[PDB]
Amino acid sequence: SRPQVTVHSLTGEATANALPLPAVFSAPIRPDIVHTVFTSVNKNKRQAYAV
RNA sequence: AAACUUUCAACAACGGAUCUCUUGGUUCUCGCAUCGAUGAAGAACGCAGCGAAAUGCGAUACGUAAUGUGAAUUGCAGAAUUCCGUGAAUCAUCGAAUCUUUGAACGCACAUUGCGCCCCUUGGUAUUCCAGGGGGCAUGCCUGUUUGAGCGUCAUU
Numbered sequence: 001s002r003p004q005v006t007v008h009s010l011t012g013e014a015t016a017n018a019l020p021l022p023a024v025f026s027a028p029i030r031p032d033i034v035h036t037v038f039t040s041v042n043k044n045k046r047q048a049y050a051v
Numbered sequence: 052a053a054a055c056u057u058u059c060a061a062c063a064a065c066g067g068a069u070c071u072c073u074u075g076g077u078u079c080u081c082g083c084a085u086c087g088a089u090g091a092a093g094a095a096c097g098c099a100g101c102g103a104a105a106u107g108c109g110a111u112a113c114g115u116a117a118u119g120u121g122a123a124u125u126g127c128a129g130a131a132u133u134c135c136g137u138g139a140a141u142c143a144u145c146g147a148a149u150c151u152u153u154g155a156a157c158g159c160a161c162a163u164u165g166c167g168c169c170c171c172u173u174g175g176u177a178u179u180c181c182a183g184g185g186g187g188c189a190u191g192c193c194u195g196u197u198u199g200a201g202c203g204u205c206a207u208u
Contacts, residue, residue, distance in 0.1 A: 050078050 002026075 002021035006014050 048079050 002023065004018045004020055007017050007019060009015050
């Protein structure tokens with residue numbers, strides 16, 4: 001089990017309700033993968049140009 | 052030493068690089084089907100108060116009518132407009148018009164702005180003729196229509 005996260009209201013006040021961490025926040029933070037995937041994905045929304 | 056030649060610097064010249072811009076181009080994607088014998092695409096001759104191209108237009112000639120907008124156009128000159136409205140405008144829209152000479156080009160022609168024919172015709176008595184206005188007369192082929200022709204076939208006391 002994880003620490004747990006407090007949910008705030010629209011007035012910016014800590015409501016008594018708490019939520020468990022989804023365990024995606026316990027994934028490996030990989031800067032090298034994010035870089036080598038982003039560079040390929042940022043190329044996709046791109047048009048052709050030609051002389 | 053000056054001049055002269057050369058080098059550097061400053062200020063002028065010459066040239067249009069660099070920077071920045073951009074009513075342009077190129078490429079990709081999406082949608083739609085829309086030229087012409089009712090005479091197109093194209094060529095020519097013209098047309099605005101003052102015009103080169105461009106753009107627009109055809110003797111109704113950078114337009115006429117219609118509909119909307121609502122008060123300009125403006126390079127210059129000059130007109131306007133009752134502006135509480137049938138109405139300014141090189142405005143927008145665009146369905147009605149005109150639409151020169153040509154061009155598939157179509158009366159006959161060759162490269163003749165000639166050579167004509169018929170219909171309708173207002174004028175110069177127009178019965179003679181003369182002039183003006185307006186629409187037609189190409190080829191092939193289809194559906195007809197019509198005057199025919201054909202010992203092409205048959206009928207016929």
